[PDB]
Structure formats: C-alpha cells, structure tokens
C-alpha cells in the first residue's frame with residue numbers, strides 16, 4: 001500500500017501541483033504544503049534543547065529513512081544516538097505539538113551506511129532508524145514506496161521533476177508549516193561543472209538552470225527529507241533521493257545534491273531483513 | 277520556539 005495517499009489518490013483528488021510533475025515526464029521559493037500531501041514526512045527532533053534536527057521519511061511502520069549526516073558529522077561534532085532524538089510523524093506545523101494528529105516515536109537502533117564518506121563529499125549519505133514500536137497509519141501518516149530498478153530507470157531522467165519538502169530555512173525565518181518545491185533533475189555534466197566537490201554515482205542533482213527563470217532549492221534544516229516522484233504507470237509516490245548537500249540555498253548556477261536511494265537499495269534491504 | 281511536547285515522550 002505505499003505511496004497512495006489517504007487524502008488524495010484514495011479519493012481520486014489531485015494535489016495542486018502534481019500535474020507539473022506528471023506533465024514533465026515527456027525550502028527556498030517553495031509554497032505551503034496542503035494537509036495530507038506528504039504523509040511520509042517525518043521530523044527528526046532533538047530532546048534537549050528541543051529542536052528540529054532534520055527531515056526524514058516513513059518507509060514502513062517500523063522504519064525511517066534519513067541522511068547519515070543528520071546523525072554523524074564529526075566536523076561539527078555531531079554524533080547522535082538513539083536516546084538523543086525523537087521521530088515525529090504526521091506533522092504539518094513546524095513548532096506545535098499537533099495533538100491527536102501527530103505521533104512521536106522513540107528509536108530503537110540507528111544504522112549508518114558503513115561507507116558513508118563524511119570526510120570528503122557525503123558519499124552514501126544514508127541512515128535507517130528502526131522505531132521502538134510500530135506507528136499506526138492514518139490520513140496524515142502513510143509510507144512512501146522505495147523504487148525498483150525499472151521505476152528508477154524510467155523516471156530518474158534529466159528534465160523530470162521531483163518534489164522536495166521540509167521545515168528548514170526559507171532563505172540562505174524558518175516556515176510556519178511544511179513547505180514544498182518541485183525541481184527538475186539535471187544532467188550529471190552540468191552537475192559536475194557547477195562544483196568543486198567530487199560527485200560520485202550515488203548522488204544526483206536537482207534545480208532549475210539560471211536561465212530557466214523558475215527557481216527553488218532545499219536549504220539548512222531540510223537535510224534528510226525526501227525527493228519523491230509519482231509514477232505515471234501505477235500512480236504511487238516513490239522516493240528517489242535524500243536531501244544531502246548544497247553550496248548555499250538557491251544560488252544561480254548551483255544545484256542541490258541528493259543521495260540516490262535506488263543505488264543504495266541493496267544496503268537498505270540487507271539492513272531491514274537482517275534486523276526486522 | 278517549539279511547543280512543549282508531552283513529558284511521556286521525553287521520559
């Protein structure tokens with residue numbers, strides 16, 4: 001049942017921009033999200049001081065997917081463990097305890113990809129979190145589909161738009177509610193020529209060209225959230241990327257870089273079945 | 277500016 005949203009697909013209602021995404025298959029400058037539009041969205045929350053750490057996604061009732069750098073980044077003396085954090089699923093508002101809508105979960109075990117490269121370029125920026133007990137789904141809480149080789153193959157193409165969401169910075173004010181932006185995937189060439197960081201195959205970049213006129217990007221606080229695409233074949237939402245890194249937020253000539261979830265699916269399978 | 281979450285969770 002992944003990727004079919006209780007309030008949209010299941011009732012045959014389209015959200016207000018998904019057609020831009022479907023028309024293309026030939027947060028800075030985003031908008032406020034509608035209620036129930038990304039029910040897989042998770043907030044990673046620090047207990048003391050109480051604060052937004054990162055975004056994340058619900059992929060099953062037991063498991064959350066996030067960027068490894070949200071948990072361990074030794075340059076900034078960041079190394080969190082299970083009891084440091086709380087996962088808050090079902091939210092829309094950044095700061096309010098949305099009583100009776102959201103669920104807060106405690107973590108059982110964090111798994112960071114063993115070859116996560118924090119030293120040089122955040123290569124394999126991916127971590128899994130097994131929750132203490134299952135979250136029950138609802139109108140506001142529903143998992144996203146992880147892609148298969150064939151959905152990865154036909155959708156992750158230059159020009160095809162995807163959608164990024166998060167409660168991070170609006171500029172390089174944090175928002176009141178969840179923001180959303182739809183960004184085109186960019187050709188690896190262009191991606192490599194915009195930066196000095198060595199790009200690897202476990203990454204892709206998204207954003208409009210300086211001449212395309214539209215603009216938008218992820219920014220600080222958005223890390224760990226989902227880049228998702230809707231399949232035109234079975235109508236579900238698949239998560240293709242994890243918000244990883246950028247050089248500022250929405251600079252011209254620069255693009256955001258995302259962990260390629262399909263390229264690391266084997267490590268994700270291996271951890272889920274060997275641990276629950 | 278986070279609103280105080282229930283202590284039950286913080287325990």
Ligand SMILES: N[C@@H](C(=O)N1CCC[C@H]1C(=O)NCc1cc(Cl)ccc1Cl)C(c1ccccc1)c1ccccc1
Pocket residue numbers: 069073120121122197217218219220221222223243244245246247248249256257258
């Ligand atoms: N700005 C750094 C970044 O995005 N960092 C440093 C580590 C955490 C991550 C970040 O805050 N990402 C959130 C983010 C993601 C996206 Cl997609 C777009 C904008 C932003 Cl701020 C980044 C960097 C790239 C080039 C020059 C300096 C720094 C960097 C890349 C690779 C290795 C180290 C640093």
